[PDB]
């Protein structure tokens, strides 16, 4: 689709059974998602927020659907305020900026 930017670009994603609202965020390198159960193996990672650094769990090779477009990539899981789709998944769905 084509997304204008007058409003936050919140889309529905499908991940690990579940529907979630998430932000399409071209200023984010990585994808970070609120607390959820993902199956396989993970490692801990630190990432920045307004408070300081939060610890999150890194799951690699996770299947996510983003507005009907399926991607595989790393998803970080932890106490983020906002569900953020970053560039590591936006490249996977072929998302560009256009003007």
Catalytic residue ranges: 25
CA distances (Å), 47 to each of 11, 44, 70, in order?
Answer: 23, 10, 25
- Binding partner of 96, given a copy of itself, Mg ion, none, CB within 5-8 angstroms per partner class: a copy of itself
Residue among 40 and 51 whose Cβ is closer to Mg ion? 51
**Nearest alpha carbon to residue 23 among 34, 14, 11, 31:** 11
Q: Which residues bind a copy of itself (CB under 8 A)?
A: 1-6, 8-9, 23-29, 48-53, 67, 69, 84, 87, 90-91, 93-99
Distance CA 29, CA 2 (A): 21
Q: How many CB atoms lie within 10 A of CB 49?
A: 14
Q: Closest distance between a copy of itself and the C-beta of residue 94, in Å?
A: 5
Q: Closest distance between Mg ion and the C-beta of residue 39, in Å?
A: 28
| Residue 29, C-beta contacts closer than 8 angstroms, at least 6 positions apart | 86, 87, 88
Residue among 17 and 94 whose Cβ is closer to a copy of itself? 94
Q: Which residues bind Mg ion (CB under 5 A)?
A: 27
């Amino acid at each position: 689709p084509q997304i204008t930017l007058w409003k936050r670009p919140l889309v529905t994603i499908k991940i690990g059974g579940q529907l979630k609202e998430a932000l399409l965020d071209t200023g984010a390198d990585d994808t970070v998602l609120e607390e959820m159960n993902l199956p396989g193996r993970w490692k801990p990672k630190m990432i920045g927020g307004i408070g300081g650094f939060i610890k999150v769990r890194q799951y690699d090779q996770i299947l996510i659907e983003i507005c009907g477009h399926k991607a595989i990539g790393t998803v970080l899981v932890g106490p983020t305020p906002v569900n953020i789709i970053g560039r590591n998944l936006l490249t996977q769905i072929g998302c560009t900026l256009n003007f």
